[PDB]
Amino acid sequence: GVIVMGTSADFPPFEFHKVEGGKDEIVGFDIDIANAIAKKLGVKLEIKDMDFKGLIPALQAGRVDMVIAGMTPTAERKKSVDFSDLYYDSRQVVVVKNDSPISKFDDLKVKTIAVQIGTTSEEAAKKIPNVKLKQLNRVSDEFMDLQNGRCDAIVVEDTVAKAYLKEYKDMKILYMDEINNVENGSAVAVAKGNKSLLDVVNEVIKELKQSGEYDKLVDKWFKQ
């Protein structure tokens, strides 16, 4: 009577902790999608918050039934788990301080770049010549690093950077063509061979899109 979802709730507006009024709720676009799935199945949704890097291992081990975490369905990951249809696009960007000497992609050479372990953002940064990778479990620490001068830049998705920059007013996004040369988009992951759940997930994503509910969710999370 339960479906267990794994996520990494450091990724507003997809999943994050909204802490106010005596509540600590994990909320976001991905959570709304998860609740639509739970409702179709007629079960209770339980969410486990963990480091992003642990999500695929948890799914493989059966510690969660599905992962929704702004997760890109890469060819590499498809060897290990199964992915739903895409439910949102995404783009890699670079975040720097307002007074950064970095203006363009070439300027990233030899720099210290904060990235989240196990991500396409990390994959993108690894291609920078002579990069000094600073690898973090959680995105929130990457922003603390940049604020405190412990890195020169962050690589992270555009929509998430925009969310963090609501608070981090001394940072800016650089839209560099070349940093986005990785697989894009987000999809739901389920364990390899779990067709029953995958089919339901794909049906729910399709019905969200076709019923108008998806557009309501997108307005709520991405059009503010």
Ligand X SMILES: NC(=[NH2+])NCCC[C@H](N)C(=O)O
Minimum CB–partner distance for residue 87 and ligand X (Å): 12
Residue from 5, 11, 13, 88 touching ligand X (CB under 6 A): that is 11
Residue from 3, 5, 6, 8 touching ligand X (CB under 6 A): that is 8
Minimum CB–partner distance for residue 1 and ligand X (Å): 26
For tokens 């690894």, the residue is 126
The Cα diameter of the chain in Å comes to: 54
Distance CA 122, CA 92 (A): 10
For ligand X, the closer of residues 16 and 214 by Cβ is 16
Minimum CB–partner distance for residue 142 and ligand X (Å): 10
148 SS3 class: coil
Gyration radius (Cα) of the chain, Å: 18
Minimum CB–partner distance for residue 61 and ligand X (Å): 19
For ligand X, the closer of residues 25 and 107 by Cβ is 25
Distance CA 198, CA 108 (A): 40
Q: Tell me if 123 sits within 8 A of 116, measured CB to CB.
A: no
Position 143 contacts ligand X (CB under 6 A): no
Stretch in the footprint of ligand X (CB under 6 A) among 36-44, 64-72, 98-106, 216-224: 64-72
Q: How many residues bind ligand X (CB under 6 A)?
A: 16
Minimum CB–partner distance for residue 47 and ligand X (Å): 12
Distance CA 224, CA 210 (A): 22
Position 69 contacts ligand X (CB under 6 A): yes
Alpha-helical (H) ranges within 27-138 are 29-41, 55-60, 75-78, 120-125
Residue from 13, 70, 115, 189 touching ligand X (CB under 6 A): that is 70
Q: Restricting to residues 79-98, which ones interact with ligand X according to CB under 6 A?
A: 90
DSSP for 20-57, written as a single string: ETTEEEEESHHHHHHHHHHHHHT-EEEEEE--GGGHHH
Residue from 5, 71, 154, 197 touching ligand X (CB under 6 A): that is 71
Position 180 contacts ligand X (CB under 6 A): no
Q: Is 84 exposed, middle or buried (0-12, 13-18, 19+ CB in 10 A)?
A: buried
Stretch in the footprint of ligand X (CB under 6 A) among 21-29, 94-102, 117-125, 144-152: 117-125
- Contact residues toward ligand X (CB under 6 A) are 8, 10-11, 15, 52, 69-72, 90, 116, 119-121, 139, 157
